[PDB]
Structures are given as structure tokens and as C-alpha cells.
Amino acid sequence: MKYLPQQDPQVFAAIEQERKRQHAKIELIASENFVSRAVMEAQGSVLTNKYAEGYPGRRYYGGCEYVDIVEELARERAKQLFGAEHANVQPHSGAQANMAVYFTVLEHGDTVLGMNLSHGGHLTHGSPVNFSGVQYNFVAYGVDPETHVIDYDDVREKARLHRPKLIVAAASAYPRIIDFAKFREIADEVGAYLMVDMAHIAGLVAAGLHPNPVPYAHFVTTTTHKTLRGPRGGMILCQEQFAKQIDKAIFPGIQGGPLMHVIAAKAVAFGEALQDDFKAYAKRVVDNAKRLASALQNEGFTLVSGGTDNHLLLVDLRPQQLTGKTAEKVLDEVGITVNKNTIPYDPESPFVTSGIRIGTAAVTTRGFGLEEMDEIAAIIGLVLKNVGSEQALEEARQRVAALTD
Amino acid sequence: MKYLPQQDPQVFAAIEQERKRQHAKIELIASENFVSRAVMEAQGSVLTNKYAEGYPGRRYYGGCEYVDIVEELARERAKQLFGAEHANVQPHSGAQANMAVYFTVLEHGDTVLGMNLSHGGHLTHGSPVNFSGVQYNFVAYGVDPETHVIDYDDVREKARLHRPKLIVAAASAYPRIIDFAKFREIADEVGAYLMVDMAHIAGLVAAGLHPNPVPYAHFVTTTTHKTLRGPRGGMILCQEQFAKQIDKAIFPGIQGGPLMHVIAAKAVAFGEALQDDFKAYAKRVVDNAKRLASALQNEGFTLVSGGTDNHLLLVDLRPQQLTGKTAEKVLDEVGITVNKNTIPYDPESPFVTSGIRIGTAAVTTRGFGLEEMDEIAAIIGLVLKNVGSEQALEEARQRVAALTD
Ligand SMILES: Cc1ncc(COP(=O)(O)O)c(CN[C@@H](CO)C(=O)O)c1O
Ligand SMILES: Cc1ncc(COP(=O)(O)O)c(CN[C@@H](CO)C(=O)O)c1O
Secondary structure, X not given: OOHHHHHOHHHHHHHHHHHHHXXXXXXXXXXXXXXXXXXXXXXXXXXXXXXXXEEOOEEOOOOOHHHHHHHHHHHHHHHHHHOOOEEEOOOOOHHHHHHHHHHHHOOOOOEXXXXXXXXXXXXXXXXXXXXXXXHOEEEEEOEOOOOOOEXXXXXXXXXXXXXXXXXXXOOOOOOOOOOHHHHHHHHHHHOOEEEEEOHHHHHHHHOOOOOOOOOOOOEEEEEOOOOOOOOOOEEEEEOHHHHHHHHHHHHHHHOOOOOHHHHHHHHHHHHHHHOHHHHHHHHHHHHHHHHHHHHHHHOOOEEHHHOOXXXXXXXXXXXXXXXXXXXXXXXXXXXXXXXEOOOOOOOOOOOOOOEEEEEOHHHHHOOXXXXXXHHHHHHHXXXXXXXXXXXXXXXXXXXXXXXXX | OOHHHHHOHHHHHHHHHHHHHHHHOEEOOOOOOOOOXXXXXXXXXXXXXXXXXXXXXXXXXOOOHHHHHHHHHHHHHHHHHHOOOEEEOOOOOHHHHHHHHHHHHOXXXXXXEEEOHHHOOOHHHOOOOOHHHHHOEEEEEOEOOOOOXXXXXXXXXXXXXXXXXXXXXOOOOOOOOOOHHHHHHHHHHHOOEEEEEOHHHHHHHHOOOOOOOOOOOOEEEEEOOOOOOOXXXXXXXXXXXXXXXXXXHHHHHHOOOOOHHHHHHHHHHHHHHHOHHHHHHHHHHHHXXXXXXXXXXXXXXXXXXXXXXXXXXXXXXXXXXXXXXXXXXXXXXXOEEOEEOOOOOOOOOOOOOOEEXXXXXXXXXXXXXXXXHHHHHHHHXXXXXOOOOHXXXXXXXXXXXXXXX
């Protein structure tokens, strides 16, 4: 940085603290990642100065010839990555991508069926303090109490009983592959649209390591910043038949001018995801998650669903008599970042919880491999089994520093 | 740029075209501006990697100590700039800032009174193809047919008749000072909240060149990218009594994770606006707009409301027998960027219009002064009075190039 240090010492000092923090900690928050320098440069460009309401070649302002090229690169690369017939790369976030699909096919008060929030569903999938839950009537399907795998008979029974206009599949904390074919089969049975929110697994889908929802869902939403390793923002994928309606939902529907500099960064990230090394990266994410899962089981931890098929895992801390809040707090003391997270049928509230959610996308981006996963599990075992020992916590801090350098 | 050119030649080439385009044209779109290098560096930072749902000191993720500092700098500097009791700097855009206020005080179907869209009101102030118009019952107040100044008796009559739960004041194309005191007096008479969308005039308000809506409105919304000259995004200002509700409307209400890198850029822009030179800049914006207005009247153009009190002006092209669409297209041929814009009581549709909207914030940022305004007016006169002469258009192109270098 050159101009920021001189113009704003306070903002620069804080950014520099954050940059060093990102290097020093072991980041296991499942929705995080580290973007490339090229992606950051695209978002730090002069494209923030351009008003470009509308779409490429159909803008409401002149002079959009070059931001049109950028937006089409993003759309075409997204289409090649996921094999979608249409893409909308304007959503400002995952929340706005979801909001626009809901705005497209639902009327106020319509019934929507989504994953139980305490079993893995997202806030925008029906929380009563979110617009989804306030605007529409959400009903939920759950996972089996023992396997923790989505109960497809429960999805079907709820759909047939409540007759939702839309069914939402996917999650913020589900460690197994989701069967989109079954979701579409149930949606067809009850005449509902199917929306798949693939935010967490988008990079895995792009690398062929998770079944692609595109062929089964009417609408596919996602964030560009989780396993896809792009800038923070959203995207909607859909068949040509809903293209005009989805585009109108985003604009003039729910947003105004798009963030053209962030769209440039989305294009860059999509170009990175089309390369062979991104596929190797994604495989290492899943391999590392499996290894981490196995190593944690070796320390004596119980994992929701017994392991993982993707980038994330959930530890059920009940056997250790710990809440997720306690575990999150003590891991923060040693330099390991996780989130408390409810587990299916959790006896505790969502503010306390009985679990922690962990993902490997970020540590894989920084170059960690199987040996590092074994050590991370060993450190978490040392800390969580010895929460009252300051000597064990200091040892963990030294082991974390050895991993991050 | 260093990494982008090598990672993505296509995206880099397009960005570079856009950068050169921004230098080569005379940018008169009233909502645009050019951000500083420091603001761009803040948005091109590693803060895009951090999940930070919640607010400073009340986050849902650990490790937010440093992004908390950045967000508080933004909030505190916003509060000093506008004298507000509370600020929310998380809105992703002006559309999301407006959406959150509506979500805070309105129920689906409530009546809202806002400025007629064809007299200056914004799309998010009731358009039937926007969420505002679909979700709520909007009614509109207009400007006087001759003075083009808001008819405060019309605001009051519509409020008393329709009994809106909320009244919205401010606009995307109103060239005169808005009397917020009268708006609050009418709102109090009918028991309605008052929301002021100051997006266009925020920089002028910060420099004391436009009356501040903060003391009169329950809620003040704005974009950070127009006259405020910040990164693209939104912000909400309000009294301490609605702080918790406004914060909850943004999150968990209508958004998810905030764009922390864009919030860092908002802080930077707010720091720039607190400096004495920003006040001098803003004065030049208004001085230049007046000068430009006067010079256009000298060429024979009619201006909506007869001139301007702010950064923008509207030309009524009926006297020249031109539509705004025709004028916008021929000015684009010579390197001058304007927007077609309806004028009050326009006989043409919003897609054709009888006017063009022009603003001076961007050319003032690049250093243009009174002599440049006279020349810009002279060039627009030459072009619009000689639309069929390729010699006049080529002369205009050479005069535009002389101004931009
Ligand atoms: C499945 C899923 N869908 C949408 C979002 C929202 O994205 P924003 O860009 O944050 O609006 C998420 C976000 N998940 C966060 C917590 O909300 C996470 O840590 O999982 C999501 O997971
Ligand atoms: C008064 C006013 N309020 C909100 C917005 C929306 O902001 P976004 O960041 O674009 O969502 C605007 C935007 N105005 C644009 C056209 O929509 C302009 O050129 O005026 C606004 O003016």
C-alpha cells in the first residue's frame, strides 16, 4: 500500500493488524478463505467509480462498454464452471442472491420448505428475525437423529403436507453430500420450484468433488467468497427460461447499481477456478477435511454424521461435557479460530450450543496438508481435554505458532 | 497493478480501458465521482477475507478485534460529519440502506408517501417494478408545474388524505434545496415517520452547503459514493432511540456478512470529508453547478426550476425540439457523458424523456473550475444546436479533448 498509510494512519494501522492476524492464526471458520492478490487488485480498481444499472449491452447509463466486457467475462466463466445456461453476477451478497430468487417466485406469505436452521440451514432459509422468515411462511425438514444425514422421507412428508411453492436445499453446516436429484424428485411431486443454495460447496462443485445442483434446480444461489475463493458477494445461476425474471429481480427489483469492481474480482476468481490447479486445491480441501475428521476421532471426539464428505465438519462436544461457546473461547486463547455451532437435536440454545464447526478451505489455501491436519487435531485435543491447564494452553500456543511460522 | 496483469490479461485489459475512458471523457453523470487512491487501496485490502456478522464488540465470529476498529472509525467519523447520534455503515448499497429502513418501520402493504418518480424521486421510492412499490403502497407528491419546486401544500394534502406510515423526502434529480423542516412538520401532523434519502447531496450536507436532514428526520439514508466521494455502498443515520432496531434490520434482517474492506474505504472517505479541503471542494462543486447552469442559459437552454442550489441541473430540451435520448446519444459521440432524465410533467416516457441530467461533482474532483464550466456549456450548445453537422461534432470532440488533455 502506498497512499493509504499517508492519508489514514488509523485505518492503515488496523488493516495491518488484520493482515498480520490472518497470518498468525489457524483459521478454521468453514466459510472463510484467502483471496489471491489479483482478486484484491480487481476490487481495488477504478471500477468503483462507474454507475452501471442494467446488464451488459442493456445499461441505463452510457460509457459502460468496458465494464460490460468485465461483467460478461464473469457471466461466461461462471457458465463454463458450473455448466449453467444463465448467470447473474450482480448480487451484492449471498443474502441478496437468496432475496432475489425469493422475490422472483414467491408472493408475501407463500410457504417455503427449507433445512431446519439448527440442523444446518442458513439464516436466510427461514429465520424469524430475517426477512425470509418475516416475509414468507417457512417450514423445515430435518436430519436423522442418529446418522445426522438429511431425512429425504422427512423432506417429502413436509412437502406433501405443507405444499410449499418453493423448496430450498443446502446449508451452512451440513458435512455430507446433498442429493439434489431426490430434492428435485420431491419438488416435482408437489409442484414446487427447487432452489439450491450452494454457497459453502461452490468451489467443490466447480472441481467436480460435489454433485452439481445446476441440472436439478430451477435456481442455484451462492456466495463467491467461501470454497469458490472469490471476493465477497453473491451470484445466481439458472436456466435460460428464468433468466429475464432473475435479472429483473436483481435490477430493478432488489438492488440499484452493481459493484463493478467486485464483479471484476468475481471474474478473476472464476478464471482461477477454471484452472487445473484449482481442482487440485479443492481435492486437498476435501482430503484435508477427511484427514482432520479422522485425526479428531483419533483424539476421542465425536463428529456429527460420523465424518464429512466435503470441506467441513462438526464436533459434538457433549462427550467432553463442553458447550461450543466454551470450546470456541478457549481455542481463541491459543490462536485457533472456530465457530460454536448447534448440532442436530442440540439441547442447548444457538447462542451456547453443543458443538464447533470447522472447515479446511483457508488452511488448505495457505498450503497446509495431511501432516498439518494431524497436528491441528492434536492441538485441539490437548486444549479441549485440558481447558483448566494454563500449561497445556501455552503449549498449544507454541504449537500453533510452529504451524503458522 | 502487479498481479492482475499476469493472472488475468482479459480482465486487466478491460479495467485499463475503463481507467483511460474515465480520463478521456467529460463525466457529467450527476451521481458519479472519482475516489482517491487511499479509498481504492482500502477496498483492495485483505479485509474481504473476514466474516464479521454482527457489530463491533457484538460479533458472531471471533477474531474481529481489528475489523471492529475499522467499523467504529467509520461510525464515529460519520457521526462527527453529520452530527448523528448513531450510524450503521454496513448497508451494501443505497438500495439496501433504504430497504432496511422500510423493513424497520413498515409492514407489508403499509402506505408510504414519496416524491413522484418522474419529478425527481428515486426507483426505491415506490417504483412498481422495485421492491418498494411491490411491497408497500406508495403515493406521491409533486413539484409545482411552473417553478418545479416541491409543492409543500401537495406533500401535506397527500399526507392528510392517504395517512402514510412513513414519508420519504429527497431525490435523484431535484436541483433545489429540500426543506426538511417542512417535511417533519407535515409528518408530525399526520403521525408519520420521516425518512430523508440524502444520497445525492450527502457531500454538500457534510460541507454545510445544504441543510442537514439529521435534526429533522427519524431516519437518514445515503449512498457513500455520490457527492460524499466514497466507495460504492450505503449508510443509515438515526437517533439513539432507533439504533438497535436499525442495526437489527441490517443484520440479521436483510443482509449477512458486511463488506469489511468497503467499510474500511467508507472510513477513509469519511476522514477525507472531515478535512478542510473537502469543504473547499464541495463549495467548488456548487459554484461550478451554478456557473454551468448560467452558462447553459446563456446558450439558450431552459433549465428545470430555472437553475440549481446544489451539484445538479436538469435541461428541459423541449425548446430545442429534442428528446433526452437524442441529446444523450449525440453527446456520447463527442465524449460528454450525461443521462436522459424525465422533467416534471414530461410529455415523453421515462425511456425517451424531454431532458438531460448533469452534475459537476466528478469534473470538480478532477480540478475543473468556472472557465471549464463555461467551455462545457459552449460545447453542449454547439452539439445540441447542430445535431446533424458532423463538422460541429468533430469540433466538439477536439474541444472535449482539449479539456481532458
Ligand atoms: C448457505 C449460505 N447462504 C447464504 C449465506 C449468506 O451470505 P452473505 O454474503 O453473508 O449474505 C451464507 C453465509 N454463511 C455464513 C454465516 O451467515 C457462514 O459462516 O456460514 C451461507 O452459509
Ligand atoms: C436518492 C438515491 N437513493 C438511492 C439510490 C440507490 O443506490 P444504489 O447504491 O445504486 O443502490 C440512488 C441511486 N441513484 C442512481 C440511479 O439509481 C443515480 O444515477 O442517481 C439515489 O439516487
